Write a sequence for this structure.
């Protein structure tokens, strides 16, 4: 068989929650548009990389 | 309470932090003046009646 059922493909989809995140359409592709320094890097001293 | 984000070496290892302030109350007052008059006192008193 030239094209097998791929072992990497035989897993069932994980359970999924409904998460709030921005999704922007740039060109033809969806993208999470994300700026972390609120969730993370806030009120700690670690600089925003 | 301030959070942590665990970094890697060679960055020093930070610890949880806690902040306690206690503010002192600041106090003030207000003023208003009601002043009466003399012949007005005699009336209400019932005198001149």
């Amino acid at each position: 068989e030239a094209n097998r059922e791929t072992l990497d493909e035989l897993e069932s989809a994980p359970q999924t929650t409904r998460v709030r995140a921005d999704l922007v359409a740039i060109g033809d592709r969806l993208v999470f548009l994300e700026a972390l320094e609120k969730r993370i890097y806030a009120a700690t001293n670690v600089p925003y990389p | 309470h301030q959070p942590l984000i665990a970094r890697d070496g060679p960055h020093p290892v930070e610890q949880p932090v806690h902040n306690y302030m206690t503010k002192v109350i600041d106090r003030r007052a207000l003023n208003a003046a009601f002043s009466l008059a003399t012949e007005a006192i005699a009336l209400l008193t019932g005198e001149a009646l």
